[PDB]
Amino acid sequence: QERMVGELRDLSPDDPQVQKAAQAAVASYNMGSNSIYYFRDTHIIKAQSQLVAGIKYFLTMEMGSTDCRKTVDLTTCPLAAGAQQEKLRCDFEVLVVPWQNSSQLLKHNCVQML
């Protein structure tokens, strides 16, 4: 066949390739979001991969708003507390291809947590 569609498989949330895919998702989400502040990953809850012509990562993760405003090393950005605190739970689909340096966030659906 012409198409390459591999098996969908569970990965460890601590797989270094999941982690890189996760930082790709965060960076892209922050670029596209209307929020004043950068969000930052707090927990990878679930991770799956699928071999295509390239690799898809399907990530479920939680994010927290930071004190860092956009107007980047997120490890230096504290999670906001009290009035500015906001938590999201997101599904991300990330595309990784060996000929591109930047991994792409194909889809995302985020949801504000109480």
Per domain, the residue ranges of the chain are 1-114
- Cβ atoms of residues 39 and 30 within 8 Å: yes
**Sequence-distant (≥ 6) Cβ neighbours of residue 87 within 8 angstroms:** 42, 62, 63, 64, 65, 112, 113
What is the C-alpha separation between 90 and 41, in angstroms, rounded? 10
Domain 1-114 sits in CATH at 3.10.450.10
Name the token pair of 43.
């927990």
Give residue 79's Cα distance to chain centre. Answer: 17
In whole angstroms, give the CA distance from residue 107 to residue 113.
Answer: 20
Segment holding 70, helix H or strand E: none
d(CA 103, CA 84): 30
E strand residue ranges, the chain: 8-10, 37-52, 54-69, 87-96, 104-113
Residues with Cβ < 8 Å from 101, sequence gap 6 or more? none
Can you give the resolution of this entry in Å? Answer: 2.0
Neighbour count for residue 65 (Cβ, 10 Å): 20
- 49: tokens are 């991969």
Cα separation, 34 vs 55, in Å, equals 28
How far, in Å, CA of 11 to CA of 98, rounded? 20
Burial, 109: exposed, middle or buried (Cβ in 10 Å; 0-12, 13-18, 19+)? exposed
What distance in Å separates the CA atoms of residue 40 and residue 112, rounded to the nearest whole number? 14
